[PDB]
Design a protein around this nucleic acid. Structure first.
Ligand SMILES: [Fe+3]
Ligand SMILES: [Fe+3]
Lengths: 445, 439, 439, 417
RNA sequence: CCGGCC
RNA sequence: CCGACCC
């Protein structure tokens, strides 16, 4: 058979029934109610896109890029099973994300359970394993040509990376897929070369749903790629006559990152929503496997509970009558009545990074908030927003050149902000005083 | 204060006066953030996830632009501030009363569950606006900026709903001199209005429909003339071509919105699930009152807290009674969807006895001629009547030179998708069509 | 006075009365009858664009680029005296092109007068000087704030460069403007960075008239350009987020110069037109001032005669019944019946370049073409077309002072027979390759 | 031989049959390379430098595509390769009769020069095609590739102009059952043809105007049906908006380009130059006869060399007799043009003496008037789906108001207001 | 304004 | 595969 899904950004995205069966399942539709770009919802009016369009675009792009590379280089005779595994990994382009999208593994789960080491690529891999084990797809994976012993290892390594921690520079620590298909591990999720379909898809989707000028045209980049050996190792490389397209892509990436993903009021609302969701973690719970009340913070330990972790929790604070949920609803109401936290002051740290994960960030900030730097009163619960998170690409090899044409490498960490809302004018003066104190205190920022 | 500005993908920068901001900054208006215009179409159309907040902002912007263009083009209208504020407030209501899942709630859900209650979203918008004004103290601000609530609010409600009440000016908020301002946003007569234009533009932007319509030119070329006997806002320029392609795209995406096959079944399933879950989810009102799922329309204080979230309130529900109901929602998350048993074409139907339409369907589908078994309540019949181009186009008269040139499907989707029952369903559909009235 | 010109590429081109006075002269309408691609029209049916629109576009682009630099960087004191002066330099950057553009000085003049060195930039300078002295342009130059004694020298240096040859590396060899305006010599005629308005405009025009994809957009480059000091001097630099745009521009340049300016049949037709002019050089007289009869080749020595030397001469040979022009006319007729000189072979030797300009090129090629390279007989009527005519030199700003980040093709042509000519062409290509420094 | 391909900015690749190539690569067809499409409109639109050569190639391509699509779609019409080649040849040779500056030569010049002869450029196209066939030896090739000259040539000529001669099928090139092939290229009745599509597309390409009509879709949705009594080509699908946009494009092109005031003034000045230089320009025809500019239409040997070059051949002329003519050309060099004197609304040969009546009314208004009188009047629907301009020769600023008043008085007195 | 449709 | 070479 053959299914096809219409998406506005990548047009017609064609899928095969294994990919659909993984896709059209309860543990992916949860994404339909978690916005990919969360904190702009009350800042950028049009940025209401959900994870569905982002995942669809990533799947379409990965399929096109792996189908072009193999018709324009039919010397290795790759197998459909590998592409299916890569597509499964790609459909986890943002899968692990929970409420408020990237916040869940960005600023929610690490902030609430500081001792827990969890990342959303590993979470996506585990959720995919749960989907396989619950939805009964493995027998039909072996029926329709996939071997879990090697295909599952390949897909898991594509999704997460090096599963183990072997320390050997002159070795390939990836036994999931044989090196005769090494280039296949730079198509769906690559963090070193930077040629990944995810960035393309989410740049195009964010531009389409925000009305910003996106010039990049991935069709030419996909259509002009071949596998070439660079330095005793094989990498997928594009042609010389595309460097302007990738410059446009990089400028689109930077424009999207600096307009939205670090917006002032966007980050302020992100911080307020994240704090309100976090502070109610234990007493507004969902039930997982075995009926255990494994709360939102602890829901990372089980996938059955982790399924029901969506943006609804936000609303579940806004429309709740319980006395314990009072504070959350109150704060949300102050968000609705335009009593937002107005923000003033910014810095960037140069002294390596913080010691703790996020706990000590607030306490030192509150401490340094007060100082005798020449209004009245004083406070301690004032916010501290810490955001942590020229194409440097050498995959320009030419197909005609067997192992050359690198074009001489194409020729050539945290932002902290404050917010004071004591009074109409008193808050501005207090914010200036605190900005002075914190600046003189933030490790000589 | 002064103008605020909000960026939208459709109309770019939308500049609003302080009164419009005060209207926008309300819980009863920010509730619209979780109301998708295309609603259920999301489960079959990926990108159509826009919300009612931008739709309201866009309708307010379009109405302000229209009134400003009319004022600049025709100084003889003598536009004042009361008209501008009232028109903006009425414009920002282009879906104001819409509840959970918008047109699904009143087009298919509320009328199906309890046919005895009159539910139209314009009256709900009027009640919600009244609650907003009363709670938020809007009347003092309206006095503060010079507009008169006693007539502007009545005019806004009439524009939101229609006739205020002997075929002599049913609207009692404005005299006969402002005969064109009442069709800037709603325009129940002609069928082309700023609400439809703006939401067409936004739907085509977020759905992949190719919209060739340029609304700015139409706005810039508006003058007030006489059509038959009274004043009517007529398009000064000859935009017949543009509006031809406009109605083409309108039919394209209007019929795209009324989805077929998968979309219709998904919508019906969602509705039926809400109807089953009505008893197992409670909504709190004002004064401690608890109104059931369907009866929450009678109080605007409680209706302010009615958004799509009720959907989620079943998806996160654990009370045992809703169990079955929750499963039906699950039935659209996973791909085990039911197939539709056909469609047919036909006034004989109103807001009464529609809830028994499947029963008559059950009269023909079960126990059909030469048919054995396969009989149940599988009928989930859908009636979508709801509410060339044949455009009506409704300094000294005689210039309005007009140029030269129904029932929806009887769709009964079978709740049970059994493969064995497929042949029985085909036979039942043939018998039903050839028996009742249709083909 | 304020003129506006509609161009397909640049839209509305605004000009001021000095530019109009220069334009509406006999020595500019001469450009209107000279093909941009002389031998490209007999290959591309759309390439009928003339040098007139190209000059208009180049002048407009130069004016825009010098007008932006001074509004977004008002430290170099750019005045109305400078913008018009530049625009004039751009508008006359090709004023001296002869019949069939680059052919006239590319292959004709070296064949006709090998002892005289001629380039169409010198022709532009001489034609502009004649225009100034004859059309009374000095009074209106002085009327609109210009000093002809220095402005004419500045424009002439803009067209060609250093009028004199001073022996000093560390010197400013221009008498037009001091080094405080060095950037002004990087707008119309650039030899190092390759970013000049001339190339932009003629690339855009060739793309419009050849159906090629034009990715470069000069509007963004203009809007994001500033003057920056690189090596003790001022140079025009773009923004960092434009390197893809300039890569697209360079690839457009390469594609245009490998499709059209190196086209096989285009160059063959260029050679045929050149031969027809040569055979008719002695029998065609043009009369200037004083009745003096200057031939086609010698008309470069008088501008009054050189004005009336356009592409019409081609037709003036074709529609001629004079027996002495017979041979020339014959060749032109062979162009119409498409009896072109068939060509086989294209080699480039590694032994530097050709010694003479055009005379010794033909004779040695024909002579060496015959050898016992393992048909029969021999001939000497074989032409030899030798055409001579990567992003590091382009500098751009780094952020918001910033600095930069971190040749002879020879072809032949034999038109003997369908098979004999091919064999002889292969034999001659073998012989020339084995003889011309083991080419 | 083999199929040829020509690159055009409008239609991309244009594939031609070898017979079409043999027809094209002839002097009487390559003559179109030096005849401007818009003609005098070029001196008003610097980008409109396209010629009739690419227009003819494009019209041939469009007609071939349309006929091939009709043949493939509906086999009951029994369209063969002979019909396709004949339609293509009629497409390529539908404007061979155009003279210098295209429509100016017969719309403005011929009626003044020779009012006793009725001359339309379609007849010139027919005569030029006949001369092309006879001189270039096309008939052996037409016989070689399956065409039958005795009737195929008559069919092509009929497609160019129409009936050579009881209201019963006047055409004699093909039977009455193929009544739709006669309106693919010319289409005098319906008014939509490949010629109009191609020259609209090219005008919009070279003028900056927007082109909304996609001809490929219309071709792909074309079927032959019956409206009243006979077979007629029509758009089977409802491309009504596309056709309305095409007609809007037609109206815009006609209003802006073909009716520009300065364009008409340029045409009038070139026309006056030709009328003055008629007696003193000799063109060698066939048999050594010398045909004037006006009398070169009677012999195709002289008419082959009658192109826009004669313009330049007056501009650079040194004979004293041509002096006056050259001087009038000199005016365009300095943009000295006739000024506007007003507009008014109501055969070209009868209007040859028009200015005299203008001199009858402009003089002694409520000779200088005769001198300044340069009057050049130059004066969806039925589709199956699913003004006077007296250019003022005297450009005197003081006399401008008097000339305007005289023209107004003349118009408001004689027959108009 | 004689190469604008403001 | 001489008005193209890969649109
Ligand atoms: Fe140039
Ligand atoms: Fe024509």
């Amino acid at each position: 058979t053959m299914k096809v899904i219409n998406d506005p950004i990548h047009g017609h995205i064609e899928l095969h029934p294994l990919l659909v069966r993984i896709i059209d399942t309860p543990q992916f539709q949860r994404l339909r109610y978690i916005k990919q770009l969360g904190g702009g919802y009350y800042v950028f009016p049009g940025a209401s896109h959900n994870r569905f369009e982002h995942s669809l675009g990533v799947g379409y792009l990965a399929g096109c890029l792996v189908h072009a590379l193999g018709e324009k280089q039919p010397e290795l005779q790759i197998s459909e099973r590998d592409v299916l595994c890569v597509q499964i990994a790609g459909l986890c382009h943002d899968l692990g994300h929970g409420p408020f999208s990237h916040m869940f593994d960005g600023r929610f789960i690490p902030l609430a359970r500081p001792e827990v080491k969890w990342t959303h690529e590993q979470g996506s891999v585990m959720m995919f394993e749960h989907l396989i084990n619950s939805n009964g797809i493995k027998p039909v994976m072996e029926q329709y040509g996939l071997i879990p012993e090697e295909d599952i290892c390949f897909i898991k390594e594509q999704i997460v990376g090096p599963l183990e921690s072997p320390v050997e520079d002159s070795l390939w620590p990836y036994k999931g897929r044989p090196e005769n298909k090494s280039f296949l591990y730079e198509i769906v999720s690559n963090k070193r070369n930077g040629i990944d379909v995810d960035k393309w898809d989410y740049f195009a989707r964010d531009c389409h749903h925000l009305g910003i000028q996106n010039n990049f045209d991935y069709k030419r980049f996909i259509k002009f790629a071949r596998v070439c050996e660079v330095d005793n190792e094989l990498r997928i490389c594009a042609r010389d006559k595309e460097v302007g397209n990738l410059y446009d892509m990089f400028h689109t990436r930077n424009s999207l990152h600096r307009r939205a993903y670090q917006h002032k009021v966007g980050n302020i609302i992100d911080t307020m929503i994240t704090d309100a969701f976090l502070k109610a973690d234990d007493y507004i719970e969902i039930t997982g496997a075995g009926g255990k009340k494994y709360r939102i913070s602890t829901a990372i330990d089980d996938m059955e509970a982790y399924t029901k972790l969506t943006d609804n929790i936000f609303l579940e604070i806004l429309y709740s009558t319980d006395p314990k949920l009072k504070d959350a609803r109150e704060i949300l109401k102050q968000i609705e009545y335009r009593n937002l936290f107005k923000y003033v002051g910014e810095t960037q740290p140069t002294g390596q990074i913080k010691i703790k994960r996020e706990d000590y960030e607030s306490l030192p900030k509150e401490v340094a908030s007060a100082k005798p730097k020449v209004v009245k009163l004083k406070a301690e619960d004032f916010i501290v927003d810490v955001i942590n998170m020229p194409i440097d690409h050498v995959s320009f090899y030419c197909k005609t050149a067997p192992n050359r044409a690198i074009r001489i490498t194409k020729n050539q960490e945290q932002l902290i902000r404050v917010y004071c809302k004591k009074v109409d004018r008193k808050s501005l003066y207090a914010a200036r005083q605190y900005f002075v104190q914190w600046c003189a205190d933030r490790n000589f920022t």
